[PDB]
Amino acid sequence: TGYDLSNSVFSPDGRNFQVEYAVKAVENGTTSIGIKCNDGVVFAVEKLITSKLLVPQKNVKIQVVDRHIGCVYSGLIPDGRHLVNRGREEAASFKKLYKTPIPIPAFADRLGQYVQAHTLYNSVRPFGVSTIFGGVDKNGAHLYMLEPSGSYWGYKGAATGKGRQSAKAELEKLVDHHPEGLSAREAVKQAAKIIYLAHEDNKEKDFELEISWCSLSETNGLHKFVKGDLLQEAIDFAQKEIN
Amino acid sequence: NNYDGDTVTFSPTGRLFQVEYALEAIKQGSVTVGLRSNTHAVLVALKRNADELSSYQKKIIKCDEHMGLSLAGLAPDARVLSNYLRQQCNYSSLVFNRKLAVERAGHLLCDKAQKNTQSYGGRPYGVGLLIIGYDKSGAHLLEFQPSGNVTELYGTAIGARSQGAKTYLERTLDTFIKIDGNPDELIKAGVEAISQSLRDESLTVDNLSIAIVGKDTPFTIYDGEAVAKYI
Amino acid sequence: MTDRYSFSLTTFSPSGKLGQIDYALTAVKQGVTSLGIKATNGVVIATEKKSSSPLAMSETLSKVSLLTPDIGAVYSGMGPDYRVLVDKSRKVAHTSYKRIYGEYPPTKLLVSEVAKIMQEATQSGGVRPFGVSLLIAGHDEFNGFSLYQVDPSGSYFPWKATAIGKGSVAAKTFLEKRWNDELELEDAIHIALLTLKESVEGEFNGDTIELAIIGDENPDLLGYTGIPTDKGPRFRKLTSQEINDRLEAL
Amino acid sequence: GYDRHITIFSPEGRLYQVEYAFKATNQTNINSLAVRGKDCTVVISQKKVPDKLLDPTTVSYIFCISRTIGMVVNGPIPDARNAALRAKAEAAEFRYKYGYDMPCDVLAKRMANLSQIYTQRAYMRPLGVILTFVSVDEELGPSIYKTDPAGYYVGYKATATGPKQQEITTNLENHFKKSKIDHINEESWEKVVEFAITHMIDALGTEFSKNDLEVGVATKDKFFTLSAENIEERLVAIAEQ
Amino acid sequence: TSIMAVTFKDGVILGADSRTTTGAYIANRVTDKLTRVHDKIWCCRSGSAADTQAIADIVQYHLELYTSQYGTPSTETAASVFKELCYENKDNLTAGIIVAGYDDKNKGEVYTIPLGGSVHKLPYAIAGSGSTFIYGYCDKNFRENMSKEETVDFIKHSLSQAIKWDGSSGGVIRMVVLTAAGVERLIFYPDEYEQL
Amino acid sequence: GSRRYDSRTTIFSPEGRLYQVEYALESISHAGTAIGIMASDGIVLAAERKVTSTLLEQDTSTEKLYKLNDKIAVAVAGLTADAEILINTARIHAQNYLKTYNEDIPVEILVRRLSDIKQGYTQHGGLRPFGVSFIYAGYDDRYGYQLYTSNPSGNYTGWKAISVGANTSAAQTLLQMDYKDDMKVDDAIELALKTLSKTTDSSALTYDRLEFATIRKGANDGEVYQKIFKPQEIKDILVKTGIT
Amino acid sequence: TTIVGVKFNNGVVIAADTRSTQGPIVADKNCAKLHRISPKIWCAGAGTAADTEAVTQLIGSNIELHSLYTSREPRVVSALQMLKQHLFKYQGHIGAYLIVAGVDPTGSHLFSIHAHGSTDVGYYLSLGSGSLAAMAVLESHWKQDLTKEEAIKLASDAIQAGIWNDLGSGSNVDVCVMEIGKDAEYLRNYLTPNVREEKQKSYKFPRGTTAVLKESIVNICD
Amino acid sequence: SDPSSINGGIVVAMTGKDCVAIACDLRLGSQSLGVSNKFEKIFHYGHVFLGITGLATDVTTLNEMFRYKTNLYKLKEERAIEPETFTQLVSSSLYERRFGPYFVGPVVAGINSKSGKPFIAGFDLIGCIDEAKDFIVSGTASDQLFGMCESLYEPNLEPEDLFETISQALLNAADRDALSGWGAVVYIIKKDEVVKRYLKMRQD
Ligand SMILES: COc1ccc(C[C@H](NC(=O)[C@H](C)NC(=O)CN2CCOCC2)C(=O)N[C@@H](CC2CCCCC2)C(=O)[C@H](C)CO)cc1
Ligand SMILES: [Mg+2]
Ligand SMILES: [Mg+2]
């Protein structure tokens, strides 16, 4: 064997073991999710409080791309940042040439092709993050999740990291119980809840919650962070539900 | 083991061993401490010497009038990274007439270190940095690790036996965070924090290094007779 | 990113063999039989069109290729490797000859260029040798008719007649018995068809055999008239019908 | 054996990395099939959405390469999209350079050449995909040309790809033995689609709802895919028979 | 050269004369200056014939690649691609292009890209050497939301006058109608338009 | 990365030899023997082809003996295709010299540059060496008739008589035994053929398994002539010395 | 030069005079201005002599390679696109003015190309110094639905107008006919209306008229 | 300033009955100053003859280059290059320098050794081939040569007659040109003998 020592080598079953090893780094990361809603998308993530000494609210992890796209990811944080920097260059170049802001499906393939390119050669390592991202364009809201292999699809809701299973089950209930749709303000609340539920699988250290959203009606189709009254209102709705 | 030959290889559990080994050079590093109030931010660093005939290796580098850092690990790597910061601070000034936000300094360092963890032939940086500064949103302390992870803190420490100072700072949090408008009291708390990490030895006059930046204070470094005030 | 394979992948072993070249020749051995025979007034090259599924349309896969109007090629070994060699061989006939001298290269010189390309895949960084042997038949004014074999090493040799691939030992023996310096083209076509029956398992008709000739100029294949000195390609692919006509009187 | 990690020959003259790329081709567990009408070329492929959280409309392995060419992939989606982007760029460039639309067979050859290069040059891995290209060519008529990780390609009367490909293949060969012609003798593409789905059903021994399939059709001057609805209307007509 | 594009109730119409000159010699009296860069996005070309053909060909290629990946491009997007080429290569190009297309969301749109590569969205636009002579006329007679027959008449009367006064314009008047209905090519011969 | 698959073609062994050069020489030692003999009035090149088939086209063939210019030829032992790469280089090098100085290139100068090219592949670039040894036969007006050899190391030396390829050990002993300084071309021709006759791994030496060339002062006064022998000419010269 | 192209029923015809000039001097009295790009695509060229010839050979070479690669008969629009893009790139410094015509699986075609890389479509075209004399004739006699014979007559008449009236054109008329479903027929020196009259006198000299200083035999052998 | 008329010189070639002739003057000057009286402008590669007029440094450079290329041709093809082929090689070589050309007027003359056909061609500085049945002219007295050839010439002259005709064309053209003359050389070329004669001419 030794098929797993070098990126881009096919094993005899037809797998790239280095990518599968990158997936292990993703599973080891904190939980993050996205919920697609009526006219928008909501992103949230668990930030482990390592120590008293972290400044609350001041280690932001959700990232904006252009003005209409949010990205969150689990795994190696620097890899996620590198991927978002590339996403930003891709969005700028699309807008520069075509004038309109980059459509979400278009943006999803730019990230996909770039991540897939890092499975083509033994001189690079695959990305050690799964990335949840999306926003609002001329055709509505879109949510996407992208793996170290470069695999991505459109999602009704999505989750990754240590609590991906608990979150997935929780997301599935919402999809079954709301076939007409979830509102943006509703989806923010559910997001808080699921991050709290999913924090079960990671309960050594307690955590700080972070949420963001794009909604045609609630944020004018722009990406904004949920802070203040709306954040605390959703923290409380989550607290209520674990008790 | 079979997976630690270079930075471009994941282990079967998703680890990057060359990065983990770079992290290890930090752990063998002499101890340094960072902490801040709402008005100032302070670095304290224990300098190490080669023997009794040698100098005590500098661990504190000024990056701009409002920003600087302390190092633990490979010193040449700190010089490379600090030089990059000097340039980034400088570009912000010349082009935008704008002092670089400590937070951007952090993001820029994370991204610089990250590149060296995903490509063949390069190696990760083998040094950890504590970055203090005073910008348009006040005092800041940052912890840089060569994995690329950068973190904003009220206080922290890195190097050998930095665990003591870090627990102390964890207890002391509510005290030092409000040493506003008082330079010498933030320092003394920093010097106290670092003392929780000494063994066989204590802080002398050619051994201790302190820096401060804040509201009406340029980043300045004290060594020699100017630290005697503090022992 | 980028190619960091700038070192040779073919090297000398302690016994002196170049392993990758030997292994390429082994792939050629497994390949379907092909052959060529030189007559006094022509050359014939032939092979079996062994189809992969019967749903495949094997007329869309040509094993015998025109390189210039007077030169053709056939191979044994890896088909995809052959296809790109044909692309390059066609192009080099122009870039390194026709664009300079205003005429197509003589057979040995085109063969020389293909051989160069194959030799380089034996020494350059980060590549493997081509997994094919070629038989190249052609005509040119000052050398007349010729037939060459090119191997994975880049070595080439002129032949009166030969065969390569699977059943080449048996077919070379067959041709030794039947070849003389007085063969007329039609006789060489007939001998080619006999030799190829030995190595073919299944159906043996004009839809499973591919066969071309380098013979007389074909004015009807030129596509225009009015230049007296342009008389047409000497390369002609035999049709399915033409092959069957010769298989009954076999 | 490092002859098993990169694309150099093994002692028996084989390229293991190419062979293992063929094995990745079946990773998705989807079967695809293509047939030619008189007027059209139809391709169908199974559609499996396991996760309930997926937006099913974004799950596809059929691609519009140009106005006239469609491509279906058997293999993992990241490699499939890589191939689709390249083929799209190549078809656009061909049109710009040469002043006419890239023929299906020529695009197939071009992509087959790119794949050949990955089997010879060490630094590039083969893509773990098989690519079936379809069109109604302006010179050649209805066309199916298929590419694999070895860089092989050929035209087809009809073809199939995937884990249960042999079943579908023999099913189709048996039809063409009986019919004695090169194609589905049918005027409307709707009925050629119906044939395709029908012979997929016999061969695989399974029934399909409207969300279990994915269909692409090529006619003179366009290639298009069908909605769940156009498929249901097609499923309904097979049932009433 | 005389060219124009006019938005109206149902979409947009482009029109042009058919003359191309080398000095005072008419090199082509039946030129087609209305060129398709997408199904329902067309442009009219003025300036250097070589430059505007080279540009239109590159734009057609970009929009065919855009289409493959992202679906039908907006008229704004097409105008942006023309601009990018005209602005970045302003030293080496002599191109004055009018872009016109029909979205279903956006209805008819007209963008004019003059010599320096600036962009201007307008209800209608005129350009080419002959356009100078009909600024007065066109300003007086244009209204928003005209009908197809009104718009065809406006263009026919406008280009009639440009042709009458400008020696570098002439031949036939070609028009292209862009609506939800499809694409319609009109042509009008001298004997009709000369005596309006 | 890719380091894993690098054979490192240009390193020293612990004994201080060059592996790939040594292994290239081992390869050459199985090639058809080629012999060069230098006389006072010319040079012989004789070489044995690799085990022929009756169907090989013997008269339009060339495998061992190539023309570099009108005054210089080489005999090849090793990989033919590797040798052609070097031969075209050498031909071009000769023409550059003629173009620059309006004089035909001195034999050693051509030999040195080819040997320098070989040397480079042993020291940098990480590529395999050329699996070729040459015997150079040529004339210039400084040293008259000259023989040299080069091998994959890029080392070259001058000779009165020399062999390369298979059985050079036996061949060198036989040449040493019968060579004399005052010898003529026609005696050297005979010596070359008899030496191949005794070292050959075949049963008997025939015309169809040979290539043969002379470089004489053999036309009209002071000017030099290269004769690559046609098959019939080899057949005759084989009888004329009584080997058949 | 004078050169023309005329469409007819089932194909297209091109023609050219055969004069080449350097300043006021005739350099070649019978040059060939009709160029084969592929067997059924032919090109007439005016302008800088070597440029028309080189650009036509380069594209002809690439068309051949393209035809082999695609297994199709080459199209006139491909030759047109390759020529225009090559010429545009060189900003008019390659002084080739070309009439491109032929038949391909798409039909019959006629285009012109200017040196800066702009192209036209038409049923009748003319280029070169004599193009105004030729276009006068074409505009006078051309009609929709010409037979092959009518088109050949029109085209050679157009060239004749150039030969007689343009000092930049002279000597002979060359023609090429490209008809759908047939071989292209190249008619080299189709008309020869400018044969030199008999000279009045033979200027052959008495042998020994020329004073010689030395002689020698040149060695062309080995 | 005009590179084609700094040095001076002429070349002319003619076909006859199974023969060809090519001739040139011997002058090399620097504008008004005559410098060398022995500067020959005709060379040969095997049996193919090349004359070159124009800028003398390019004349020399092109001779050395075509000797280079024809030597390699012969080694690889194993036969002498023929005039038709060599003419093509001259053309491509000149055109390769399209935008920084050699300032020359070359002339090819020879008999094809397979067909026996006499062959002549001329070129412009940029490679345009002028193939001719009768004669080719080149250099600073090319108007004069065109006048002489166009009246003196007739088809199918025997070698000894062609000699007289070509020599008179050259001599009388040169005497009307300030930058041509100072000696002349004529080559009479038949299938396998070539005679080279130096003419006596006025030395002003
Ligand atoms: C920019 O300068 C020019 C342009 C065009 C001409 C006419 C042309 N003659 C030539 O090209 C002659 C052989 N060569 C030259 O005049 C040398 N020129 C020097 C400076 O650069 C250009 C090359 C010529 O004869 N053109 C013919 C068509 C040719 C005939 C030869 C076969 C190829 C086509 C034609 O256009 C009529 C006679 C006038 O152009 C001269 C100078
Ligand atoms: Mg590879
Ligand atoms: Mg310009």
Ligand SMILES: [Mg+2]
């Ligand atoms: Mg007018």
Ligand SMILES: [Mg+2]
């Ligand atoms: Mg004089």
Ligand SMILES: [Mg+2]
């Ligand atoms: Mg004088």
